[PDB]
Design a protein around this ligand. Structure first.
Ligand SMILES: Nc1ncnc2c1ncn2[C@@H]1O[C@H](COP(=O)(O)OP(=O)(O)OP(=O)(O)O)[C@@H](O)[C@H]1O
Length: 416
């Protein structure tokens, strides 16, 4: 049960040193942060600790993909420290490393109310347990060193708090190796577990899942698992052309086709019928003569087929109507993946219209949950982050949750 894990509000931090794992993997264009959304997201957890008398808050996170070797020139968290200070209003001590006697000493007895940010955990191959040398050759971490790394991290605080849901699907040292008597989820993690608990433990009904994306094969377990809990499912995006070709014998031109996935489609539909799940597929499409932002546009339906040399990049007006009718009946919605190439405005209208409908549903009480990744980015583009119930901060992690797997980082949390 994701609802029985220990969270920050139920943890006494008065006079305690708090070692907190956060998600500060922010976007950078070299010498500056373009989006500080992730940083602003951690603030509530940090302020809570400081406001509740914590002795200190030690922040650890990763940035980019260093792959096990120090790359301060490219992926140092120093810029984040400066950005965090402006947002928190308090000084932030940035340390050039995350482990060692020097670091342990700075954290052994800091000035009350201190906020410390350690350097990129991934500068050490012991965090991921694997990496690469300067030559690009694969290097596997040494067990004894992994032990020493985790023992060091464990010395930086008295209680452990995990607010990095985006990395919880990884058995990395900072996720499962900090040995402290209290391991609690932070406020962001609390939200992730509370909403996905609904999507998998006790959802409101009807429960509709909107599944988009391009590939089918890598989404087989997700669909399989969702078919065990939903009442209705919209299958859109590039994904639908595999379904439409197999079941309807539709001519799809040069639209995405998943040979692997195509062999399991009838079986998925079969399970859908056995469970009484209503499947809604697109009936019309916006086509393009090439996969490009400026391609020529056309229109097509399932009956007309798609011209040779053309591909479906978005659903048409008739599909949007059907999609909106499904949203209308639901009391709960989980949406993972865009219904078209939302990166390009000409093919983002299908996705935008659905977002509008989902926001409207939210206003009347619908529990709307948006998965991480692209779809999550959609909410940032049209500024609807505050118009839905929950926007997941973990792309790959939210996917593994929806698949029915146990997240190592969630599993390691203390139980209430
Ligand atoms: N009809 C289509 N043809 C080709 N590509 C498409 C189509 N519809 C959507 N896409 C592309 O699918 C990509 C997303 O697919 P992918 O399987 O990678 O992720 P996803 O399941 O949508 O996850 P997320 O929730 O992160 O969006 C987007 O970049 C989008 O441009």
């Amino acid at each position: 049960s994701l609802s029985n894990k220990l969270t920050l509000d139920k943890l006494d931090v008065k006079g305690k040193r708090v070692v907190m794992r956060v998600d500060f993997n922010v976007p950078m264009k070299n010498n500056q942060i373009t989006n500080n959304q992730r940083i602003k997201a951690a603030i509530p957890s940090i302020k809570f600790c400081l406001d509740n008398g914590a002795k200190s808050v030690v922040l650890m996170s990763h940035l980019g993909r260093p792959d096990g070797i120090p790359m301060p020139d490219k992926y140092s968290l120093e810029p984040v420290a400066v950005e965090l200070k402006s947002l928190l209003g308090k000084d932030v001590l940035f340390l050039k490393d995350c482990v060692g006697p020097e670091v342990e000493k700075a954290c052994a007895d800091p000035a009350a109310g201190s906020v410390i940010l350690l350097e990129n955990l991934r500068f050490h191959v012991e965090e991921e347990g694997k990496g690469k040398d300067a030559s690009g050759s694969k290097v596997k971490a040494d067990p004894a060193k992994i032990e020493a790394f985790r023992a060091s991290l464990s010395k930086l605080g008295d209680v452990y708090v995990n607010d990095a849901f985006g990395t919880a699907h990884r058995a990395h040292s900072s996720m499962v190796g900090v040995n402290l008597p209290k391991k609690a989820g932070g406020f962001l993690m609390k939200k992730e577990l509370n909403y996905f608990a609904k999507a998998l433990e006790s959802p409101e009904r009807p429960f509709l899942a909107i599944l988009g994306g391009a590939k089918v094969a890598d989404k087989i377990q997700l669909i399989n698992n969702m078919l065990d809990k939903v009442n209705e499912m919209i299958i859109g995006g590039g994904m639908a052309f595999t379904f439409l070709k197999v079941l309807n014998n539709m001519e799809i031109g040069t639209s995405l086709f998943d040979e692997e996935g195509s062999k399991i489609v009838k079986d998925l539909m079969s399970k859908a019928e056995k469970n009484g799940v209503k499947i809604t597929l697109p009936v019309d499409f916006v086509t393009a003569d090439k996969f490009d932002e400026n391609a020529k546009t056309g229109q097509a339906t399932v009956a007309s087929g798609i011209p040779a040399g053309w591909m479906g990049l978005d659903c048409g007006p008739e599909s949007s109507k059907k999609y909106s009718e499904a949203v209308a009946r639901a009391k709960q919605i989980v949406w993972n993946g865009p219904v078209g190439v939302f990166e390009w405005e000409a093919f983002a209208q299908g996705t935008k219209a659905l977002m509008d409908e989902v926001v409207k549903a939210t206003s009347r009480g619908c529990i709307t949950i948006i998965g991480g990744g692209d779809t999550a980015t959609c909410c940032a583009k049209w500024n609807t982050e505050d118009k839905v119930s929950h926007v997941s901060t973990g792309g790959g992690a939210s996917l593994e949750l929806l698949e029915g797997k146990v997240l190592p980082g969630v599993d390691a949390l203390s139980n209430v």
